[PDB]
Design a protein around this ligand. Structure first.
Ligand SMILES: *CCC(=O)N1C[C@H](C)N(c2nc(=O)n3c4nc(c(Cl)cc24)-c2c(F)ccc(F)c2OCCOc2ccnc(C(C)C)c2-3)C[C@H]1C
Ligand SMILES: Nc1nc2c(ncn2[C@@H]2O[C@H](COP(=O)(O)OP(=O)(O)O)[C@@H](O)[C@H]2O)c(=O)[nH]1
Ligand SMILES: [Mg+2]
Length: 166
């Protein structure tokens, strides 16, 4: 087979995990996607002259979750820039990933979503300071304008390649 990448999208309720995933896959913005629907999605992509399948768990609400945490190769830590609590929660999501990998050394990208909204309560400097503390990239996205969406997923792929031979 071609190269596959197993990605897991995590973060608090309502930050835009499903909307970011739908935008990557369907190039459209969903206003209301059932918050309860946990599913995996696939997408063939070319990234730096390599054809690959992305296998993406969009977390919601489990032997599948268990298996994706055990075998997932990289994580998007998603918060919304107009949701301070969601940003504060990132710590707890990173800690759950570290438990499961028994490791500090896990490919991750910090994603600040809803960049299109004016009610921004998490500044870029807070986000950049947290990503720096974690040793990981920070990418601002809007699932609505699609800004940063490819960037976030491609950067995670590249972080996986930096960590391991594919
Ligand atoms: C709209 C509802 C919604 O999207 N969410 C977000 C998320 C799916 N969620 C949730 N809740 C929760 O209490 N914790 C989660 N932990 C994980 C995920 Cl995928 C989702 C949630 C999780 C990891 F991110 C990584 C490894 C892992 F094992 C894991 O699950 C552990 C069990 O859940 C725990 C355990 C400890 N803390 C937390 C929170 C981070 C505080 C979770 C449901 C809902 C809010
Ligand atoms: N304006 C705006 N709204 C968004 C964005 N991303 C998600 N939303 C909205 O925020 C709500 C929660 O999004 P959803 O993707 O379901 O959150 P999830 O619980 O993380 O999957 C929905 O009503 C989305 O339309 C964004 O980038 N911009
Ligand atoms: Mg969702």
């Amino acid at each position: 087979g071609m190269t596959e990448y197993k990605l897991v999208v995590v973060g608090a309720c309502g930050v835009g995990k499903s909307a970011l995933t739908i935008q990557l896959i369907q190039n459209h913005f969903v206003d209301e996607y059932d918050p309860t629907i946990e599913d995996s999605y696939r997408k063939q992509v070319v990234i730096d002259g390599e054809t690959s399948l992305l296998d993406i768990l969009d977390t919601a609400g489990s032997a599948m979750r268990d298996q994706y945490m055990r075998t997932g190769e990289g994580f998007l830590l998603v918060f919304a820039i107009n949701n301070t609590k969601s940003f504060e929660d990132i710590h707890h999501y990173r800690e759950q990933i570290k438990r499961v990998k028994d490791s500090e050394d896990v490919p991750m990208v910090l994603v600040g979503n809803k960049s299109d909204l004016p009610s921004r309560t998490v500044d870029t400097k807070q986000a950049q300071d947290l990503a720096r503390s974690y040793g990981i990239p920070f990418i601002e996205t809007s699932a609505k304008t699609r800004q940063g969406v490819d960037d976030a997923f491609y950067t995670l792929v590249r972080e996986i390649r930096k960590h391991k031979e594919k």
